[PDB]
Amino acid sequence: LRVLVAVKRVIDYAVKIRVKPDRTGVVTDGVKHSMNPFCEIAVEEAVRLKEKKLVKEVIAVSCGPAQCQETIRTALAMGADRGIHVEVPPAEAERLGPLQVARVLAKLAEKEKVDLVLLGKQAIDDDCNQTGQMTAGFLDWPQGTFASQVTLEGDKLKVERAIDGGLETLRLKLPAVVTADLRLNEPRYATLPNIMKAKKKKIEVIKPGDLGVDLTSKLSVISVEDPPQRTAGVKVETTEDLVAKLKEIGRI
Amino acid sequence: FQSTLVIAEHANDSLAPITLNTITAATRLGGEVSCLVAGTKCDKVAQDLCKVAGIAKVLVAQHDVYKGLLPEELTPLILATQKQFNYTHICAGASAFGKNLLPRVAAKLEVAPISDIIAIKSPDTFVRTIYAGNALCTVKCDEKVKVFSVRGTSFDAAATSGGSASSEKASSTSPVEISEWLDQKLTKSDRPELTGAKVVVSGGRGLKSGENFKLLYDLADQLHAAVGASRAAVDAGFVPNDMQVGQTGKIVAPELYIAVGISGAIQHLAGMKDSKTIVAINKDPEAPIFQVADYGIVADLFKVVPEMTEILKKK
Numbered sequence A: 001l002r003v004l005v006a007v008k009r010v011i012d013y014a015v016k017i018r019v020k021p022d023r024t025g026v027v028t029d030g031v032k033h034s035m036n037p038f039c040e041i042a043v044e045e046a047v048r049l050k051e052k053k054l055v056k057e058v059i060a061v062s063c064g065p066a067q068c069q070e071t072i073r074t075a076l077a078m079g080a081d082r083g084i085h086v087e088v089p090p091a092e093a094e095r096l097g098p099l100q101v102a103r104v105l106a107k108l109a110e111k112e113k114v115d116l117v118l119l120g121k122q123a124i125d126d127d128c129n130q131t132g133q134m135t136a137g138f139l140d141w142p143q144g145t146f147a148s149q150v151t152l153e154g155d156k157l158k159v160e161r162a163i164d165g166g167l168e169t170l171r172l173k174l175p176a177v178v179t180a181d182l183r184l185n186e187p188r189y190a191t192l193p194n195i196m197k198a199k200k201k202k203i204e205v206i207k208p209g210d211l212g213v214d215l216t217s218k219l220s221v222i223s224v225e226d227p228p229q230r231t232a233g234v235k236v237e238t239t240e241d242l243v244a245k246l247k248e249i250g251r252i
Numbered sequence B: 001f002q003s004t005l006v007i008a009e010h011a012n013d014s015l016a017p018i019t020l021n022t023i024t025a026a027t028r029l030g031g032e033v034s035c036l037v038a039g040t041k042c043d044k045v046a047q048d049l050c051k052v053a054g055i056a057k058v059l060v061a062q063h064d065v066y067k068g069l070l071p072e073e074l075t076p077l078i079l080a081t082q083k084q085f086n087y088t089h090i091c092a093g094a095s096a097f098g099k100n101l102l103p104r105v106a107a108k109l110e111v112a113p114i115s116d117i118i119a120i121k122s123p124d125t126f127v128r129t130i131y132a133g134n135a136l137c138t139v140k141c142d143e144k145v146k147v148f149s150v151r152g153t154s155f156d157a158a159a160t161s162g163g164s165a166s167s168e169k170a171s172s173t174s175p176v177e178i179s180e181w182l183d184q185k186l187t188k189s190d191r192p193e194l195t196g197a198k199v200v201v202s203g204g205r206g207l208k209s210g211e212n213f214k215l216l217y218d219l220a221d222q223l224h225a226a227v228g229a230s231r232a233a234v235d236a237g238f239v240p241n242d243m244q245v246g247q248t249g250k251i252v253a254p255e256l257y258i259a260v261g262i263s264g265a266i267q268h269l270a271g272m273k274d275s276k277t278i279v280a281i282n283k284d285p286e287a288p289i290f291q292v293a294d295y296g297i298v299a300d301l302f303k304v305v306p307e308m309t310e311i312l313k314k315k
C-alpha cells in the first residue's frame, strides 16, 4: 500500500500570537514555526504502518511557501520516504484554505496512486477541521475522521473515531482518507542520525497549476482581531468564603 | 430571500440539544428555515422538531442506509435536497457530527465551508475563532451556497414548543456502501451532557489518579454538574477522552466552570474561556488559569474539594 500524508507548517503551539495593527491577520514573520501537532500524529501513524510492513511507501506533502520544505524534511526524518512541496508564493499562501489544499491532495492522491491519505484532524492556526473531509469528498472516498485507532484489514480499514459520546468503529473500503486525533499515537523524536539520513531523501517541487488546481477563492478575511480581554479576578481565603461568594452571585 | 437548511443531529431517537442552538443561529439570517432529519428511526425526532420555534419546514428521511449517520450516505441525500430546494445556507452545530459531515458536503457543492461560527453579521459575513480562540476572524463568503457549522455555546437554544413546521418525506437515495458502521462505546453516566451543562467541574494532572477523580464526581453531584478534564488527565488515564475540554476536545461555556488542578494552558482555555464564572482551585499562584478566574483559591485541591462537597450538602 501507498500512503500520502499531508503536513502543515504553523506557528508553534506554545507561542503567544500577535494580531497585526492593520487587522489583516496575525504576525507570522520572525515567529517560531513547527509542524502542526495533528500532522505529526498523521506522519507517525503512516510510519507505524510501514513498520508493520503493511505500507510500502510514505509520501509527505506540504502546500505553501519555501519554509514548508523544513516541515517536509521533519516528516522525512520521522520516517517518510519522499516529499512533495506544492509551492505557493507567500502572498497567495495567505489566501490558501482547506478547499485549495483538498483539491491539491485529491489530484496527488490520484496522480501518485495512493491507497490512503492521512491528515491531522485540524490545523492549530485556522482550526478548520475541513481538509481531510473535503479531500475525501473530491475523491469520492470514504472518510474516517478523528481517528484514535487504525487497523488495516486486507483491502479494508477499521477505524475507531472520537465522537461526542465516546467512540465508534467503522470499516472503510480502500482507498480511504483518515484524519488523526491526538489520541491516535505518540510521535517519535527524530534523532540526529535520522535527520542526517533525511537529507539524502528527495523532495519534489510542483505548483498547484501543474496539477490543474486553480487557487481562486470566494472566501475573504474581512478582519482579524483580539478577542475581549479577561484578566485576574479575586482571591478568596477559605472554601467557605468561595461557596458564600458563588451563592450570593447566584451561581450556586 | 435567504433559505437555510439545518441538518438535525440525533442519536437513539433523541434530538441532540445542539441542533436547537443551530436553529437560533439560522434565524439570524432573516429568511426561511428548514430542518432535515435523516436516520433509521426519525418519527419522534421529526414530530419534536415540528414543535420547535423558528422552523418553517421539516423534511424526514427514514431509511436503514442512514444507520450511524455515515457522511458518505448523508451527503447524497443533502445534495439531492439542495438540488430540489436551492438553499442559500446549509448548516449544523459544530459538534463531531457536524464537523464530520459539512465539509464533505461543501466539497461536493464545490464551495469553501466555514467552521464553528460564533456570529452571523449578515447573510455572507461570519465571525469565527482562530489560533485556539486567541483571535477573532471575520470572513466574507461569496459562495453560491454558504456551508457552515455553528458554535453551539454561542447561541441560545430555540424553544421546544410553539413551532408549527410542516413535515414532508425527503428523496430516498441509493446505498453508496463505501463505509459501514460497526459499533460504538459510549461513556454513560448520571451527569448532564458536558456541552449543555450549566455547571462543569474539571480535573487536570493535579488529581494524580483516576481514583482521586471520584472527588470531582462527588463535588459535581452536589452541583448537578458535568465533569470535564484536561488532556493531562485523559493521557494519564484518569478519565475517558470524551470528557476532554479544549481546542481539541469539547468547547463549553457553562454558567459556572470550576478548574481543579488544571494549569490553564492555551489549549485548555480554548474550550472554557467564555464560561460566565470561572473558579480556580490550584496550589500554584503563577498558574495561568488564575489570570482568567473570577474567583480563585490557592490551596491544596485535596483539602478544598472535599470541604466544598461537605458545605454543599447543607445550606
Ligand SMILES: Cc1cc2nc3c(=O)[nH]c(=O)nc-3n(C[C@H](O)[C@H](O)[C@H](O)COP(=O)(O)OP(=O)(O)OC[C@H]3O[C@@H](n4cnc5c(N)ncnc54)[C@H](O)[C@@H]3O)c2cc1C
Pocket: A013, A037, A038, A124, A182, B203, B204, B205, B206, B207, B229, B230, B231, B232, B233, B244, B245, B246, B247, B248, B249, B250, B260, B261, B262, B263, B264, B265, B266, B267, B268, B271, B281, B282, B283, B284, B287, B299, B300, B301, B302
Ligand atoms: C495540539 C494540542 C492540543 C491540545 N488540546 C488540549 C485540550 O483540548 N485540552 C487540554 O486540557 N489540553 C490540551 N492540550 C495539552 C495542553 O497543552 C496542556 O498540556 C494540558 O492542558 C495540561 O493539563 P493540566 O493543566 O492538567 O497539566 P499541568 O499543566 O501539569 O497542570 C497541573 C496543575 O495542577 C496543579 N496541582 C498539582 N497538585 C495540586 C494540588 N494538590 N492541589 C491543587 N492544585 C494542584 C498544579 O499547580 C498545576 O497548575 C493540547 C496540546 C496540544 C499540543
Ligand SMILES: Nc1ncnc2c1ncn2[C@@H]1O[C@H](COP(=O)(O)O)[C@@H](O)[C@H]1O
Pocket: A006, A007, A008, A009, A036, A038, A039, A042, A061, A062, A063, A064, A096, A098, A101, A118, A119, A120, A121, A122, A123, A124, A126, A127, A128, A129, A130, A131, A132
Ligand atoms: N497547507 C497545507 N499543506 C498540507 N496539508 C495541510 C495544509 N492545510 C491543512 N492540511 C492538512 O489538513 C489537516 C487539517 O487542516 P485544517 O482543515 O486547516 O484544520 C492538517 O492537519 C493537514 O494534515
